[PDB]
Each structure stands twice: as structure tokens, then as C-alpha cells.
Amino acid sequence: MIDEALFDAEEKMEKAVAVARDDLSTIRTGRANPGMFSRITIDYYGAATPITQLASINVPEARLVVIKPYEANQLRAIETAIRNSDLGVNPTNDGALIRVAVPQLTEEARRELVKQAKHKGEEAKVSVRNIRRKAMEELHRIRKEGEAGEDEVGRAEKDLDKTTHQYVTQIDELVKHKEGELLE
């Protein structure tokens, strides 16, 4: 049915756009967020484990992160993972807390990250397009087989085209915004 193809495709695009927002969040910036720490993993009893699951990540000032590990025995293993990461960070030790001052990025690094953001956007747009294609070829099958009227299917095609472009644009705003986060 038109409905299933159309309503599910929309719902999937929303998820894809949501995934892209989260994905952009993982990029290092100025205006530190937790997301930049999300893909730092420690050895946690044999399982490669994100620090995000193992510590409460707080942002007091603009360029200062405060990380509180649930298990004090883990603190040194966490700080090292931060120290050995690709964040460009020199974390200090407080005892219960890890003090992470985040430096302003170099112009070279920020052109490389702007690059990273465009790519994550491109991936999500392609994903959105694939969702449209699957729903559109269902519409095409409905038409071919005469399971719905021609005018009916052509309105649904027009609707799907609109929905798709709205979500692609949303992804483009999402990148446009991370780009401006990175170039200030």
C-alpha cells in the first residue's frame, strides 16, 4: 500500500536525520560536548567499552570538561584513553575527577574537521536517498500492477519527493551548523 511505503519511508528518514545529528556531535569543536569523547574506548574487563558508559561527562566552562568515572579503579585507564586519543587534549588528574581543558583548534585541524562534517552529511543524504528509492520503487510496483490509481500514485510520488528533500536539507543545515561551529 501507498501508506505503508510512504509513512514508513518518512519515519526512516527522520531516524536517518537523527543519526546524522548524533554523528555530527562526535566531531571535536570549540564548545566541547560529550560527543567528542563518545568514541574513546577503554579495556573494560575484556570488552572494548566507550568512556561515555563508564563516566559522567560534565561541561562547566566553555573550554573545560569534567569527567567523573563511576569506578575510581578505572580513572587512570580513562585519562590515558583521552590522552592517547585524537582530540588533541592534555588531561590532568584531580583524584576523583579528570580535568580536561580543551584547546582552540588549529586552522589546519578545523579545515580537516569541516571536511569530516561534510562527509558525515554526504553519508546521511545517500542513506535518505536509498530510503526514497525503496519507497518510490514500491509506488512504481503499485502502479505497474494496478493496485492503486495513476493520479493517486503520482500524488504520492510528489509527496515522497517533498519529504525526501526536506530531510536532505535538514542534514545540510545540520552540517552548515557544525561548519560554523568549527570556523569560530
Side-chain angles (χ1 to χ4, degrees), residues 1-67 69-75 77-184:
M1 139 93 338
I2 309 282
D3 292 356
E4 262 90 18
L6 222 58
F7 304 177
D8 180 45
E10 171 176 339
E11 170 184 277
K12 279 168 172 166
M13 289 173 196
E14 304 165 344
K15 182 77 209 94
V17 179
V19 155
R21 179 231 300 140
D22 293 359
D23 197 29
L24 294 163
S25 278
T26 72
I27 303 168
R28 49 182 218 257
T29 159
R31 294 267 167 312
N33 86 113
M36 59 167 55
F37 298 94
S38 72
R39 315 257 255 261
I40 308 154
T41 48
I42 70 164
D43 166 281
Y44 188 64
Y45 303 76
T49 308
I51 299 172
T52 51
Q53 310 182 180
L54 310 162
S56 79
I57 303 156
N58 209 56
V59 197
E61 93 173 345
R63 297 215 188 119
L64 193 77
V65 197
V66 157
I67 297 152
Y70 307 133
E71 296 168 355
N73 211 104
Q74 294 310 295
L75 195 135
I78 293 180
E79 182 166 321
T80 302
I82 297 155
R83 201 197 316 287
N84 298 346
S85 67
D86 41 296
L87 282 175
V89 158
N90 277 323
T92 35
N93 193 18
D94 150 271
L97 305 186
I98 299 162
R99 315 268 299 158
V100 185
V102 188
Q104 177 165 282
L105 298 153
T106 66
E107 208 136 318
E108 305 81 64
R110 84 209 311 162
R111 268 188 296 259
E112 195 266 347
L113 266 16
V114 157
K115 225 150 174 197
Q116 286 217 256
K118 305 176 96 200
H119 193 268
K120 287 177 187 309
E122 293 156 10
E123 285 180 351
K125 282 147 78 155
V126 162
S127 167
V128 154
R129 285 171 185 141
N130 286 348
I131 299 163
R132 175 187 169 280
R133 184 48 70 215
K134 181 172 173 320
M136 187 64 82
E137 295 306 314
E138 177 60 12
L139 303 177
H140 288 180
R141 190 202 56 91
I142 295 164
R143 188 158 43 195
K144 186 72 146 204
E145 293 321 330
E147 298 172 6
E150 274 186 288
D151 183 47
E152 167 169 20
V153 171
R155 293 292 273 268
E157 289 175 301
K158 270 158 166 137
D159 189 45
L160 180 57
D161 284 352
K162 269 199 75 278
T163 291
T164 308
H165 191 49
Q166 293 182 351
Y167 286 116
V168 163
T169 297
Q170 280 189 210
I171 289 161
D172 271 295
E173 283 161 15
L174 225 36
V175 174
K176 180 193 183 285
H177 298 165
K178 210 74 182 184
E179 207 151 316
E181 198 178 302
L182 278 154
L183 310 154
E184 84 169 346

